[PDB]
Amino acid sequence: VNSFSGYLKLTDNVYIKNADIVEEAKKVKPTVVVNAANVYLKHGGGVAGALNKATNNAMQVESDDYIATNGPLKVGGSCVLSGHNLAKHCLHVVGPNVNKGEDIQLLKSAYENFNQHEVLLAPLLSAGIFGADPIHSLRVCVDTVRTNVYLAVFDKNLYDKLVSSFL
Ligand SMILES: Nc1nc2ccccc2c(=O)[nH]1
């Protein structure tokens, strides 16, 4: 048993809810929250901008030190950093950004990072301002992630479409 409430069960291991991931993280304080990161860990908008704002920019300060030491992530890659006031850890995962012309086949590689963690609170990778079809992102999630993932879908309208179209 875990602290996640009000989720619809899609599969053995994947759950979904219409919720703001920031407000969900603040309430649950999960072991892992996933950020929809870019390779530079520049948290300007969407999940990354909203999560970073909720940390009072401490996520960005930590991220800048990480990049200064290690250089950029790979598209499809990840790093584990602090969760600040939102979670124990933040798993920064880089899905392909369609609005930059990145290979959508890298979405499966992105979701494979989740398998290194037993339980996660996450957004749909490559959705929103990353430009991919969220229905596709949910299919790749279900077909790739084997650990227990709690998906927060910010947009009410999209949530209802994801559930009502789910195979
Ligand atoms: N507060 C906030 N929450 C989000 C959750 C998912 C995607 C985007 C966002 C966003 O842009 N702002």
Swiss-Prot record:
Compartments where found: Host endoplasmic reticulum membrane
Membrane topology: Multi-pass membrane protein
Domain Macro as annotated: residue spans: 1-167
Regulation: Inhibited in vitro by GRL-0617.
Effect of S164L: In strain: Gamma/P.1
Catalytic activity: Thiol-dependent hydrolysis of ester, thioester, amide, peptide and isopeptide bonds formed by the C-terminal Gly of ubiquitin (a 76-residue protein attached to proteins as an intracellular targeting signal)
Subunit-structure text: May form homohexamers. Interacts with N protein.
Record function comment: Responsible for the cleavages located at the N-terminus of the replicase polyprotein. Participates together with nsp4 in the assembly of virally-induced cytoplasmic double-membrane vesicles necessary for viral replication. Antagonizes innate immune induction of type I interferon by blocking the phosphorylation, dimerization and subsequent nuclear translocation of host IRF3. Also prevents host NF-kappa-B signaling. In addition, PL-PRO possesses a deubiquitinating/deISGylating activity and processes both 'Lys-48'- and 'Lys-63'-linked polyubiquitin chains from cellular substrates.
Protein's name in the database: Papain-like protease nsp3
Organism: Severe acute respiratory syndrome coronavirus 2
Gene from which this protein is expressed: rep
